[PDB]
Write an enzyme that holds these catalytic residues in place. Structure first.
Site, PDB file in Angstrom:
ATOM      1  CG  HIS A 114      -2.239   1.393   1.708  1.00  0.00           C
ATOM      2  ND1 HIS A 114      -3.156   1.037   2.053  1.00  0.00           N
ATOM      3  CD2 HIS A 114      -1.811   2.040   1.284  1.00  0.00           C
ATOM      4  CE1 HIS A 114      -3.647   2.028   2.134  1.00  0.00           C
ATOM      5  NE2 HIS A 114      -2.380   3.420   1.814  1.00  0.00           N
ATOM      6  CD  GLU A 115       2.345   4.652   3.652  1.00  0.00           C
ATOM      7  OE1 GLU A 115       3.673   4.573   4.591  1.00  0.00           O
ATOM      8  OE2 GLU A 115       1.564   5.472   2.922  1.00  0.00           O
ATOM      9  CG  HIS A 118       0.271   6.232  -0.279  1.00  0.00           C
ATOM     10  ND1 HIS A 118      -1.118   6.302  -1.450  1.00  0.00           N
ATOM     11  CD2 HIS A 118      -0.281   6.086   0.505  1.00  0.00           C
ATOM     12  CE1 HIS A 118      -2.264   6.577  -0.102  1.00  0.00           C
ATOM     13  NE2 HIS A 118      -1.431   5.566   0.646  1.00  0.00           N
ATOM     14  CG  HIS A 124      -5.816   6.130   1.409  1.00  0.00           C
ATOM     15  ND1 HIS A 124      -4.781   7.703   1.717  1.00  0.00           N
ATOM     16  CD2 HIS A 124      -4.610   5.839   2.301  1.00  0.00           C
ATOM     17  CE1 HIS A 124      -4.281   7.846   2.726  1.00  0.00           C
ATOM     18  NE2 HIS A 124      -4.485   5.717   2.943  1.00  0.00           N
TER      19      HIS A 124
END
Ligand SMILES: COc1ccc(S(=O)(=O)N(CC(=O)NO)CC(C)C)cc1
Ligand SMILES: [Ca+2]
Ligand SMILES: [Ca+2]
Ligand SMILES: [Zn+2]
Ligand SMILES: [Zn+2]
Length: 160
Positions: A114-115, A118, A124
């Site tokens: 997930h990170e 970004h 999100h």
């Protein structure tokens, strides 16, 4: 243009770790998250020994030179930067709580993919199966790469 990447060969350097895992286990926990994105597009993350990377990674406690500090024993497990150059691409993990390879503490693998997402340019999504889900969403750590929409997302950043 878009603020995302102009190249597909990105750089990484670590500067800190969690106490709960060893340095090799943290590198081994992120390796699986890197591959998932290198499966959704032709990109790669090349680990360096000399130069402030596109993606630099560290463990920090409360204020750390961001107007968005860490929050202690819950909530924000990991906060990444958006794509950029300087603080851009750099991913920051909370040193005020507890990491592991299991459900009790925070699955560094499940958090990490997930990170990295970004530092690419994604946001999100909150989709009932997505990876950028804002809640530390529990994906089965068995080849699961991305669910789906995170793949069509990254394809738009590096080029199909
Ligand atoms: C499964 O991966 C996740 C990892 C951290 C978080 S987080 O709580 O640290 N958070 C910040 C972030 O951008 N992390 O990706 C979103 C929070 C608003 C729920 C959420 C999901
Ligand atoms: Ca950087
Ligand atoms: Ca936290
Ligand atoms: Zn930060
Ligand atoms: Zn997030």
């Amino acid at each position: 243009g878009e603020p995302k990447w102009k190249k597909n060969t990105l750089t990484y350097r670590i500067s800190k770790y969690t106490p709960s895992m060893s340095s090799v286990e943290v590198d081994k926990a992120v390796e699986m998250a890197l591959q998932a994105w290198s499966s959704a597009v032709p990109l790669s993350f090349v680990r360096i020994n000399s130069g402030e990377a596109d993606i630099m990674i560290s463990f920090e406690n409360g204020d750390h030179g961001d107007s968005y500090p860490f929050d202690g024993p819950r909530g924000t497990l990991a906060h990444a930067f958006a794509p950029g150059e300087g603080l851009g691409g750099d991913t920051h993990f909370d040193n005020a709580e507890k990491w592991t390879m299991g459900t009790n503490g925070f699955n560094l693998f499940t958090v990490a993919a997930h990170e990295f997402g970004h530092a690419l340019g994604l946001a999100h999504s909150t989709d009932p199966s997505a990876l950028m889900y804002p809640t530390y969403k529990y994906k089965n750590p068995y080849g699961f790469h991305l669910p789906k929409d995170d793949v069509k997302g990254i394809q738009a950043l590096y080029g199909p």
